[PDB]
Write an enzyme that holds these catalytic residues in place. Structure first.
Site, PDB file in Angstrom:
ATOM      1  NE  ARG A   1      -4.478  -1.016   1.493  1.00 25.98           N
ATOM      2  CZ  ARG A   1      -5.528  -1.380   2.182  1.00 25.98           C
ATOM      3  NH1 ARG A   1      -5.596  -1.212   3.595  1.00 25.98           N
ATOM      4  NH2 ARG A   1      -6.785  -1.650   1.764  1.00 25.98           N
TER       5      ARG A   1
ATOM      6  CE  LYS B   1     -15.263 -10.496   5.470  1.00 31.37           C
ATOM      7  NZ  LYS B   1     -15.759 -10.427   6.863  1.00 31.37           N
TER       8      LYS B   1
END
Ligand SMILES: Nc1ncnc2c1ncn2[C@@H]1O[C@H](COP(=O)(O)OP(=O)(O)O)[C@@H](O)[C@H]1O
Length: 413
Positions: free
Chosen positions: A35, A212
């Site tokens: 990131r 999920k």
């Protein structure tokens, strides 16, 4: 359209750049700096193009509006940034207030400054928890003041924080300077997803897996209008298999809310001629453990009682491979097995190999961030796929067809 960094004149300008530095840590030390790396191009550009300063700002983790420097400090990121950037990075211990403001009024012609974690202040998310653990809501007056203080740190504003782009937080939609521009990471991410969604190279394959199982709803239904093929893998599959095929799934993940529309989704796929690939075989486990007793199953056999399915099997990976082979474009979101454990990581590994062969031959491969991006790092494939997203949640918002408050907040040309 929006202002972006290249269109932006920085020379002599103080730049306050929102970045996503919310990197995974373990014991204060960063486990993935992707990131951080991803922001480098925007930062360097400002430096190379004569910025007085870059004041970087980000969140790390979820401190919920209370300061937690012992546990969620961005200091280690400063140290990594300086190493990446071959230059000094000055870390401040707060992100607002007079001291920080003094530090940011007129730095030198190129000084990089990093602010402390945004979420220590409840004003960033507009809500959090107090020190006693009580859910609290921030105050509008206090929220404006916080937003004002971020404003001062800079002449002009740049958001390169793609991974946080779905969050309407103060640092992302509240920094009211005249020019607000999207950074290179923002433009690049948005461009990839947009192209993949609007005008994909075809056939377009979406690979959906992980767990999920329920959140992947708006996502599948939208994707069903965009894609030619879909693999439905990992934990999610079991819900589809029990409903469509009356599979005995044991203790495998099952999703009751999901089971309700499985039929709708499948008929939509049939209508649209989207070929759906579900797993036909599995690696089973006696318990949810890395060193669990393993087994094998098929849709037709069932999974023993009450074992659980934790990877796809060899037939499944081959069928997955056939789909990867046909595809000109791939969006992959979610691993197809519990990859963190060796016993259950083969299917994912084999899928990664195939996607990697496909990039090699010009298939556009986009990886969804989150756990999938993690597989790339783990297996060193970060530079062997077209794009590894830096934002899992934000990308999903995009795949779902939703708008990003971080993008919207930008200045219009
Ligand atoms: N068959 C399965 N049963 C239970 N858990 C699974 C299975 N397959 C994958 N998982 C788990 O799913 C998680 C990935 O979920 P998710 O966050 O949806 O993916 P991503 O972050 O890539 O979008 C991993 O923790 C993995 O261990």
């Amino acid at each position: 359209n929006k202002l972006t960094l290249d269109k932006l004149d920085v020379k002599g300008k103080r730049v306050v750049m929102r970045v996503d530095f919310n990197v995974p840590m373990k014991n204060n030390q960063i486990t993935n700096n992707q990131r951080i790396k991803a922001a480098v191009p925007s930062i360097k550009f400002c430096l190379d193009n004569g910025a007085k300063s870059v004041v970087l700002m980000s969140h790390l983790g979820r401190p919920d509006g209370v300061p937690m420097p012992d546990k969620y400090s961005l200091e280690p990121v400063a140290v990594e940034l300086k190493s990446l950037l071959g230059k000094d990075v000055l870390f401040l211990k707060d992100c607002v207030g007079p001291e920080v403001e003094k530090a940011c009024a007129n730095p030198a012609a190129g000084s990089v400054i990093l602010l402390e974690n945004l979420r220590f202040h409840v004003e960033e998310e507009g809500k959090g928890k107090d020190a006693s653990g009580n859910k609290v809501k921030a105050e509008p007056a206090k929220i404006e003041a916080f937003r004002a203080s971020l404003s001062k740190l800079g002449d002009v504003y740049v958001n390169d924080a793609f991974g946080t782009a779905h969050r309407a937080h103060s640092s992302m939609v509240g920094v009211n300077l005249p020019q607000k521009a999207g950074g290179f990471l923002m433009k690049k991410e948005l461009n990839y997803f947009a192209k993949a969604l609007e005008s994909p190279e075809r056939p377009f394959l979406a690979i959906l897996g992980g767990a999920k199982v329920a959140d992947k709803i708006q996502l599948i239904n939208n994707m069903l209008d965009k894609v030619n093929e879909m693999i439905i893998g990992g934990g999610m599959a079991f819900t589809f298999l029990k409903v469509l095929n009356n599979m005995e799934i044991g203790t495998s993940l099952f999703d009751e809310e999901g089971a309700k529309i499985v039929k709708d989704l499948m008929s939509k796929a049939e209508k649209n001629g989207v070929k759906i690939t579900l797993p036909v075989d599995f690696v089973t486990a006696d318990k949810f453990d890395e060193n669990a007793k393993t087994g094998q199953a098929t849709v037709a056999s069932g999974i023993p009682a009450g074992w659980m399915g934790l990877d796809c099997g060899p037939e499944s990976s081959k069928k997955y491979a056939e789909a990867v082979t046909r595809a000109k474009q791939i969006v992959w979101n979610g691993p197809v097995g519990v990859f963190e454990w060796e016993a259950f990581a083969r299917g994912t590994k084999a899928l990664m190999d195939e996607v990697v062969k496909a990039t090699s031959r010009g298939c556009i491969t986009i990886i969804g961030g989150g756990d999938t991006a993690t597989c790339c790092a783990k297996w060193n494939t970060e530079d062997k796929v077209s794009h590894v997203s830096t934002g899992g949640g934000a990308s999903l918002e995009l795949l779902e067809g939703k708008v990003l408050p971080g993008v919207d907040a930008l200045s219009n040309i």
